[PDB]
Design a protein around this ligand. Structure first.
Ligand code: GTP
Ligand code: GTP
Ligand code: GDP
Ligand code: GDP
Ligand code: MG
Ligand code: MG
Lengths: 426, 439, 12, 426, 439
């Protein structure tokens, strides 16, 4: 019925997408060679959501790889599950982004976007009913930010009524991995707030906090952070692939979650997350999932939701559960902690229950919170952007690629207007 | 897929290139004659070392390097040494007479005789590339060829290629130790002429590496070979992201994007850690935090200056080997917490991070101990303003008496070029003073 | 010379 | 039905709590791994009083470990039954108390109390009906005294109507184990008399006297004193876990035992206590239990009850008994020794009979006496506190951590007022 | 989890540190080269000896110690001896010229040359700790380095760390036996300068240990090695609560809390029992009561003074091995009963008790017999007022003639510092007189 096209752009986007496809292929029983070796009919009942069937009993992920540098694509192609993607979908240039939004958006991404869109349209023509697109990218780099925003604009123009989802890695509040993160982040938000339907804010700082405090991982690499992000990605679209007691696909999630067209920036979460040692000491019940979900230290975005108020909340559960227990837990959370919910929205939480738990778990639940506390991220980004722009720091690298100061001023104004709206509804 | 051309100008450039190419052949397992003992695939594949080595013939890897010198002594050391069969015979370019520590000679009088040959060789190398990212020019300021011909080649490459990144590895004139009497003249003229034609020039210092070898490596009497090997370690740490995959890759363009805030301030200081001997290697736990903290010690900077006298405008930390990114995050947060490490107010996000998988390679017969991880720091700080002011004071002292000026005037130099270069250097000092002001 | 510790300051 | 949260703070508190959990797990048939291997249904009928069931047929003690130094916690975790606690409940700092009440109450305990209270609230949310808390700690040290009093204040503020029980090891009348015991003891009583519901006074001096005179132990270590204290702790809450002829839970014990809100400091006891040699020469009858209970040389608090008068008396018996025999013994004790009971309270003794004796015994009985003779302890502590405070001995160690002389004066005044009340009702 | 940094200043400090680290390696089974024959777990675990030994490399334990000296003789004895491979090569810090028993030299003239190096080493060690409790400084009063540099380092550490416990193990000047002629000057100056910058300074005496070796160990002619080994036994008894678990643990902060009644009175006397030879070990029943009583014998104090001339203000009894706490209780009650052991009236609770499980370890080739239990007493008594008055009288006798004063004045010392130190010492004598008055 419903089908999704996955687009992953940038080094971070390609890593997260490779881990995501590993997890998805494990869920549907697709081995690294594309052959099906599952054990349940439900795995093939709705496999066309992500997989095109290439005649010969082999399935190919409906994924498109985008980058301005072939190194990350070579690493993805050579690694495990690298032989499962279609070779025609590795659309890459030779120049490189250089962590420059101006470059990756106006020169190199502009030279590559025609081929990328050709591949996108070819993938879209092979579907029965296109549900929407997913973009996996980061807001700090050059390929991710600029290329992904360009692709979002192009596709939104071509497909104005499809679901545009983005899973953006946002800059961290403590240590940046790029000196010019404020510029790229602001210039990317200026496009995301205008063209996307919902954006999930993922921050590596919160992921490290999770891996250390909760999972008790001494040496967590990106192979684990990307696995957490992939668990979130898989939990989001679990209602499109497996049956359940209460379904909620991407369209209904976007409807229930976005009250106003510009406030569509979410804080994803996941439960249960336990270390191997503490696993034998925790009973796995629906109240435990509910308690761990609505937890500030469990948010994947480095923004404390206790400093803001929730507009809407999505809680997609997976596994054999009771509707009554889930509803009672949601009602208890809304009643006992009513001061963190906006008073002008009754029944903030919208739930969904799938009958198939993740691999290895009895049950789990994905948290998607639309909280006004996300304004802290934008306030910090705007402060850093202003501090750097008042002295024209690193500004010539962007004006020499075709941009001007008017565009930076407009991006800053849009960022501050988003901040003002988020504060207005708090 | 992604190629990089190294250019080694002058004696210092050629010797540092010998060190760097020895290290490259050691890291990639290439025999001194270009052969590979594990050469399973011939004529293609990856083999990520295609960035610096081109596949020619059938099972031979030739470095993408051009060695330029005006006298045949050093290049003849190369032509009859261990790696005589490694380089292309036409990549080793020589004149017939040296520049004699005279910028005027190497720029106008002698450099004009082989600049076209060098550019034709560079064009032949660049035409064999599909994803040429940029050039690496190794030279020294206070020299002859390595200053005048370096500036001439930088101008010609900026004209020919334009948008390719032009990175330099330069031997900055030491504040106390020196070789030539006329180092201020050559340094000032080179800085003036190659300023607007360079993207990012990495600074190292022979005196600082002397002090590092004395204190850390426990080497009382190091030669130029030890300095060249340490500089080669720095170069390998810079290019490992191109030559090896890692958890967080950084190509050459990201350096000029992240480290150069203004077009005229592109002099980041090189710094490498850990640099320890094999004796004390067994007594230290070289964790990520320890190396990250040692990178900011004033006694471990590869340039003889005090970072505490200035502020950091942009910092790049390149990690290699057994490196966990969470530990990098925590160590950089700890660094940001320390009040003795001052950053400019207009740069709230001051670090750029790169993490590779390939650990440092020990050169047989080398000095540095075998470590599990290392960090190369490339920091653009306002502390180099003091070194620029020192060079300006030396230049003024020598030029007020017109000492040695005739040696340049008689070689095609117009005397007004000295005054123009001095005015531009004063303007650069004012630039460094202005960026350091909080507002 | 006087002592420096206040051993008798609150002898109550 | 009713559930208890156990909090153990300090080195002494952690040792006593480890022995207590060993004994409790032995009573309910829970092996050191958490698996149930009992032989009676009554062991599981009311096991949720102390144990949370972590799904997987494993039970986890509802215990919280608190300390300012990780050494005692490492020793507890490595020893027997150390694998039964939940790893998340070991809440410890790195600084250490240093036997300083000011430190452990205002700086280090103040830095750790937020995490401790987070764990406390998490444990409280998992209960059906919270009966109350138990705090195991000593009044002489830094972590015990200061940290436990801080936790008691915090929990009393959060839970104003729950039963707050504390099992405090009080300073000895002969040999102190800390030079500054008077200061810590007075500053701790100043909080205990205000925030707790009932406090059991345990003194190591009386425990050594018991182990030597009664048990005839040549070399008694703390493994035996802690075992006696744990026997008392288990006998106190035996009515909440096993059925009996006459039940008396913590709330009813506190009601019957505390006549006035400030006089809630008890002298615990236990019977029978016999050496192995004299075991074959003593018939075990209810009159023998009664005789050994109301015995001055059997009190676990180093205060002779013959120097004061009993306000209220609790006598919780265990094992198959006759109500008539127990009542006749209580009446004989009240009549023949009437001069040690306050004349303004008729029928001082309140009894309770449980049907399940302790492990290995035919029957036993726990003595809980609220005698005015406890004023001797407070008089001695106040004399020592005044003697040390008149010369400002060791006073800078507490004023340099945030305290002042006004707080010491207030604590001394409260101690003396408690003494005056205890003497008033005698 | 809990770490402690030992600092050994001067010849006495370095030799006592050699003894202490030999004893530590014997107790924890660490080979002289840092290896462990039973090294089952590498890179973590517990292994409670992490307090003094850091895990580096893979299967090597390095002591958390800094050895400081102004002359290279003693540290070179260390660098070429049995434990040359045990210490970190940079932890052994040396100057080039000694302090010559001159407080002025070691404090101003020579100490300023390596104080920054020592502090940087201490900072590098402290950054590797997560629960650093405090420092242990071993030195001697009447010396040079061990007095002037010790005071300088104490000041600098009080500035840098502040709230970390600063414990000292000091060789108190003997009343009759002496080494230097100017011991009163150095002792008075050190006491004045390091008084307000120290938390608790343990006192030992070479003459008292001479008498103990003569009477108890039946050693007519002991060298400095026997004294160092006895002091090492005392240090091990003090740190065993950190290094081993027991029935009643006592960290380092509890010492300063329980033994220091007033900020200016922090000189507790060390005392150890039983100290018997192997010959008479078979004829004694070393029960808890016997050792507890022997601890209060005036002939067994490690400082040459008479405890019967003063009163006890605070006493700490640290037991080790096969020790039953009931017996400790009874023995301390018996001690309190005796009227010949006088305590101050304002301290009704005079004892602090610590009981460990690890029995004393016999050093191979040592002097003390193998015992099942031992007690180290750390008693703060007013009897040390007599020793302070003796030092003050010697200082006055030497200073009234201005003897040796020029040797300090010419090294940067202002002559008024002598008078200031003498006034402060008189004030300290008055403090000791005042605390001993019952009221
Ligand atoms: N680190 C390092 N520096 C070197 C080395 N060789 C020369 N230098 C530096 O180069 C400076 C002198 O410039 P040169 O490179 O020798 O002169 P040139 O480039 O050959 O130009 P000519 O004057 O024409 O010979 C001196 O200050 C040296 O410190 C080397 O092997 N390693
Ligand atoms: N117990 C003991 N005392 C020692 C030892 N070595 C030296 N001393 C004492 O130290 C005092 C002299 O001070 P030193 O430590 O030798 O002098 P220093 O610290 O090296 O300072 P300088 O004068 O500069 O050499 C003498 O009174 C000795 O009794 C030792 O090994 N054991
Ligand atoms: N979660 C996650 N984040 C990453 C990964 N790789 C890089 N990042 C983050 O993304 C940012 C770098 O941007 P990047 O996507 O690599 O630059 P680009 O290639 O130009 O798009 C840094 O802040 C990293 O913290 C990854 O594998 N997983
Ligand atoms: N009954 C009992 N008492 C103890 C134990 N350990 C220490 N004590 C007593 O508690 C006092 C020491 O206080 P402590 O709790 O160790 O200090 P803290 O860690 O700061 O709370 C001493 O008077 C000891 O007699 C134990 O295991 N059992
Ligand atoms: Mg030359
Ligand atoms: Mg000496």
């Amino acid at each position: 019925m419903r089908e999704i096209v996955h687009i992953q752009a940038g080094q971070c986007g390609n890593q997260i997408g490779a881990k995501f496809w590993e997890v998805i292929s494990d869920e549907h029983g697709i081995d690294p060679t594309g052959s099906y070796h599952g054990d349940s009919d439900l795995q093939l009942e709705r496999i066309n959501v992500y997989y095109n069937e290439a005649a010969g009993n082999k399935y190919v992920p409906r994924a498109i790889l985008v980058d301005l540098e072939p190194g990350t694509m070579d690493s993805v192609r050579s690694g495990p599950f690298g032989q499962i993607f279609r070779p025609d979908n590795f659309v890459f240039g030779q120049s490189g982004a250089g962590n420059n939004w101006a470059k990756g958006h106006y020169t190199e991404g502009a030279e590559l976007v025609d081929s990328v869109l050709d591949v996108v349209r070819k993938e879209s023509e092979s579907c029965d009913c296109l549900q929407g697109f997913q973009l996996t990218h980061s807001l700090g780099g050059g390929t991710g930010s600029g290329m992904g925003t360009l692709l979002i604009s192009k596709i939104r123009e071509e497909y104005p009524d499809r679901i545009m989802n983005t899973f953006s890695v946002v800059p961290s509040p403590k240590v940046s991995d790029t000196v010019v993160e404020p510029y790229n982040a602001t210039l990317s938000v200026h496009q995301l707030v205008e063209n996307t339907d919902e954006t999930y804010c993922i921050d590596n700082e919160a992921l490290y906090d999770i891996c250390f405090r909760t999972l008790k991982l001494t040496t967590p690499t990106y192979g684990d952070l990307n696995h957490l992000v992939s668990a979130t990605m898989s939990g989001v679209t679990t209602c499109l692939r497996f049956p359940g007691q209460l379904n909620a696909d991407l369209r209904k999630l976007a409807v229930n979650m976005v009250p106003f067209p510009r406030l569509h920036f979410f804080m994803p979460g996941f439960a249960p997350l336990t270390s191997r040692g503490s696993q034998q000491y925790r009973a796995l019940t629906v109240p435990e999932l509910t308690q761990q979900m609505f937890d500030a230290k469990n948010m994947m975005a480095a923004c404390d939701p206790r400093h803001g108020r929730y507009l809407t909340v999505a809680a997609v559960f997976r596994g054999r559960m009771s509707m009554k227990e889930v509803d009672e837990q949601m009602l208890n959370v809304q009643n006992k902690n009513s001061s963190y919910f906006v008073e002008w929205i009754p029944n903030n939480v919208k739930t969904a229950v799938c009958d198939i738990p993740p691999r290895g778990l009895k049950m789990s639940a994905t948290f998607i919170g639309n909280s006004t506390a996300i304004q802290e991220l934008f306030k910090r980004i705007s402060e850093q952007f202003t501090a750097m722009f008042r002295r024209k720091a690193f500004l010539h690298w962007y004006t020499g690629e075709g941009m001007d100061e008017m565009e930076f001023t407009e991006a800053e104004s849009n960022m501050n207007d988003l901040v003002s709206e988020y504060q207005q509804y708090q | 897929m992604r190629e990089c051309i190294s250019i080694h100008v002058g004696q210092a450039g050629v010797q540092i290139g010998n060190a760097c190419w020895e290290l490259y052949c050691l890291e990639h397992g290439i025999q001194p004659d270009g052969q590979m003992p594990s050469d399973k695939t011939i004529g293609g594949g990856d083999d990520s070392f295609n960035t610096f080595f081109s596949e020619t013939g059938a099972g031979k890897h030739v470095p993408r390097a051009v060695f330029v010198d005006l006298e045949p002594t050093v290049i003849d050391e190369v032509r009859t040494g261990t790696y005589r069969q490694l380089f292309h015979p036409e990549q080793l370019i020589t004149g017939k007479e040296d520049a004699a520590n005279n910028y005027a000679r190497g720029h106008y009088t002698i450099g004009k005789e082989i600049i076209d040959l060098v550019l034709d060789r560079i064009r032949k190398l660049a035409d064999q590339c599909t994803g040429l990212q940029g050039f690496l020019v190794f030279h020294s300021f206070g020299g002859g060829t390595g200053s005048g011909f370096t500036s001439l080649l930088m101008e010609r490459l900026s004209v020919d290629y334009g948008k390719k990144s032009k990175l330099e590895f330069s031997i900055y004139p030491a504040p106390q130790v020196s070789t030539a009497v006329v180092e201020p003249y050559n340094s000032i003229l080179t800085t003036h002429t190659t300023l607007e034609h360079s993207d990012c020039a990495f600074m190292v210092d022979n005196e600082a590496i002397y002090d590092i070898c004395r204190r850390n490596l426990d080497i009382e009497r190091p030669t130029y070979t030890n300095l060249n090997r340490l500089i080669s370690q720095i170069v390998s740490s810079i290019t490992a992201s191109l030559r090896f995959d890692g958890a967080l890759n950084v190509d050459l363009t990201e350096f000029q994007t992240n480290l150069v805030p203004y077009p005229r301030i592109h002099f980041p200081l090189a710094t490498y850690a850990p640099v320890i001997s094999a004796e004390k290697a067994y007594h230290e736990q070289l964790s990520v935090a320890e190396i990250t903290n040692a990178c900011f010690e004033p006694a471990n900077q590869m340039v003889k200056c005090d970072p505490r006298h200035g502020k950091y405008m942009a910092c790049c930390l390149l990690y290699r080997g057994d490196v966990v990114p969470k530990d990098v995050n925590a160590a950089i947060a700890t660094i940001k917490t320390k009040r003795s490490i001052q950053f400019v107010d207009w740069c709230p996000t001051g670090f750029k991070v790169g993490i590779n998988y390939q650990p440092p390679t020990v050169v047989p017969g080398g000095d540095l101990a075998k470590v599990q991880r290392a960090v190369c720091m490339l920091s653009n700080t306002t502390a180099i303003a003091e070194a620029w002011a020192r060079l300006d004071h030396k230049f003024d002292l020598m030029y007020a008496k017109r000492a040695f000026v005739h040696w340049y005037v008689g070689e095609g130099m117009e005397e007004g070029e000295f005054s123009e270069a001095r005015e531009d250097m004063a303007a650069l000092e004012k630039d460094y003073e202005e960026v350091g002001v909080d507002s | 010379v006087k002592s420096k510790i206040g051993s008798t300051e609150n002898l109550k």
